[PDB]
């Protein structure tokens, strides 16, 4: 039996469903992540994504910086709080252009029935994400220097 | 065994949500309430271009203007006597 097969039956769609892409697992983990969830309101997703990057940006600006050889973690603290606020400009300005009239997603599931469209892509959508990326980011940054410093 | 249907206008081209499972909230009762109320005033998109821009400049203009050797080597300034030029200058 072939490990690799056409995309959900269709062999004339630009993709190949490998055991990397489609499998018993991976289809369960990626849905567990904040962004891919369909039924939840647009507030709580942005916080769960936004917070996370506040810790991925936090470690960095401590040990490699100019004041690495000394204010080393105060130095690294608000600099992680920054790429947060710029992303918020990037994501608020990303939103400012795109959405003028109604959403646009692959409406159905793998099962193929017409499920309700997500608020991930809408006028009131990316706003609460852009807010989630801020309140998550700014607060989420503070806890990489209440634990490593204070 | 036919992927060609005008009435089925979405299955045809392959707009299949690959890993978009329609599951319930695994997120907690107490914690989801902590972070709805906390992240609901900053929600609006118009308020971000007013807050993030002007308060972000207020973040640069605070930690930017606050001037000694303690944190950077320029507000430190020149801490030795001037060097001699090429055309006998000061």
């Amino acid at each position: 039996a072939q490990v690799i097969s056409p995309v959900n039956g269709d062999p004339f769609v630009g993709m190949l469903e490998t055991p990397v892409t489609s499998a018993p697992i991976v289809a369960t983990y990626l849905s567990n992540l904040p962004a891919y969830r369909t039924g939840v309101a647009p507030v709580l997703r942005g916080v769960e994504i936004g917070l996370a990057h506040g810790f991925l940006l936090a470690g960095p600006f401590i040990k490699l910086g100019p004041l690495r050889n000394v204010t080393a973690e105060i130095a690294g603290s608000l600099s992680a709080a920054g790429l947060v606020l710029i992303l918020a400009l990037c994501l608020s300005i990303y939103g400012s252009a795109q959405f003028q009239s109604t959403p646009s997603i692959g409406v159905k599931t793998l099962s193929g029935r017409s499920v309700a469209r997500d608020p991930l892509f809408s006028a009131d959508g990316w706003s609460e994400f852009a807010a989630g990326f801020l309140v998550g980011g700014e607060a989420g940054v503070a806890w990489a220097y209440v634990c490593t410093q204070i | 065994s036919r992927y060609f249907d005008l009435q089925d206008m979405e299955n045809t081209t392959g707009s299949w949500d690959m890993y978009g499972v329609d599951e319930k909230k695994r997120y907690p009762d107490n914690q989801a309430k902590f972070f709805t109320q906390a992240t609901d005033i900053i929600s609006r998109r118009e308020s971000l271009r007013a807050l993030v821009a002007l308060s972000g400049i207020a973040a640069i203009v605070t930690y930017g203007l606050k001037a000694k050797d303690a944190d950077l080597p320029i507000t430190k300034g020149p801490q030795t006597t001037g060097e001699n030029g090429k055309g006998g200058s000061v």
């Binding site: 400009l89 300005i93 400012s96 252009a97 | 821009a53 400049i57 640069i60 203009v61 930017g64 507000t75």
Partner: peptide, 29 residues
């Protein structure tokens, strides 16, 4: 150190920051 502490980082960031922002919105919309 009074003037150039303010005007350099505003011309360095805050002028291009809102310029790249308000010119992006002029392009796409």
């Amino acid at each position: 150190s009074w003037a150039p502490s303010v005007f350099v980082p505003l011309t360095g960031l805050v002028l291009p920051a809102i310029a790249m922002a308000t010119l992006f919105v002029y392009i796409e919309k």
